[PDB]
């Protein structure tokens, strides 16, 4: 069962991946939250067209198990949010990795910090929402993360 | 006291596979257990997708043999997740906030260079929690 | 402070079966559709409770042919457990721990009447409820 | 209530019981035998064959009075005489009573004995309810207060 994370003008679903069996109820669940864009980081298994037809732009942006995001994925992630909250005020960004508690929330926590949340607070906020979040490796990257932007 | 002491570990749980057929001898095997609540796994036992209540089975007969996997899509019972370290009073809230008087028991996992996960440990019901409260 | 009376389920609202129930499909279905662990058995006034049906009792029936209720209750001969309406929650809590069972049936005494006193039966209370009333709020 | 109640006081000893069926007759008699009763007094539910009880040594007396009614003086006199002898003639032993659920006129009769054995009226009443919650309605309390002992 999926997780909302609101902070200010920003809005995030952390999800699980569907099967093709669940795909309709998955897409309907996305539509319920009013999403414009999925990012798949993991479980890149199912037909994306039925989701993209319903309005929901799907990006396979895969990186590694237990890893911080590659810098290029960061910049695409940052740019995606920056427009999509400005272009459609209100709307949500969906992510899933494999149980939604490693690299998927890293991308979220990334965003929060870039929105000028303190590192620790960003982290705690996520962990409040989903307990277990981040390995030590990713926590570090978060800590070491200086925002610009 | 955490869930963990009161937890039934997974091997010792009665459960059923997701492509169970409910024939005579299966429906009996459900009954002869006498749990109110029977979990539904796929196909690794730690992976639990759905949740047979009793009153589910009331409205089947073993005609023809009827799939389990249908019945569970029918009522679409939510399944309730608990952490291992949840202290017993805190668990008791979750049963009271839920309809449900069973939760499946998740331990976290930061062991491994991977992403975290929830390990699945086993099961804890209302009855067990009270059966500990008395002791 | 709080007595059993407050945690009680009143008698009309209890799921009960009569002692000459026959256990065909549709009764067994109603039993499961209740989903009580513990269904009490009356004869033929309701306030008159004779025996106690556990769930694992029905497990060793099939609805062949139709098999009668009053047999099954004779089988295990399950003991049944009485508590007074005015017993306090912590005290009734003691009785349950002395019990195997986690369900009491609830009498008050009846002093109205020129007759001998008698035990009026008021209804049911389960261990569950008693705890569910010491979360309290 | 099917569990019976002993009430001891000095050389006096009293089982209050339920009546059996015949289906329960043996286990009833064995239960009386356990407590070492020499005499049943049936006040109600005189429903069952008494010989299987008396064959086992236990004298069975049907001394009925009605529900609500107090003990008739002759019953009072007979009860009191029964105990006075029966506790002297066999030291140790118990008398059984039953009426219906044993919180009305049966424990009256017990109370009556106690008062005659020099228990304060109030004290008897409590001592009973101690062993048998709900004993005595109003009318019997009125009776018991109004009872004046002398005897044995």
Author numbering:
A (entry chain B): 5 to 153
B (entry chain D): 318 to 452
C (entry chain C): 317 to 453
D (entry chain A): 3 to 154
Paper text:
Recent reports have shown PRL phosphatases bind tightly to the CNNM family of membrane proteins to regulate magnesium efflux.
We compared the structure of PRL2 with a disulfide to our previously reported structure with reduced PRL25. Oxidation did not induce any large scale conformational changes: the reduced and oxidized phosphatases overlay within 0.6 Å. Disulfide bond formation moves the cysteine away from the CNNM loop and flips alanine 103 so that its methyl group points toward the CNNM3 aspartic acid residue. This shifts the CNNM3 loop by 1 Å, which may contribute to the lower affinity of CNNM3 for oxidized PRL2. Crystal structures of PRL3 (C104A), and the oxidized forms of PRL2 and PRL1 all show a deep pocket which is closed off in the complex with reduced PRL2.
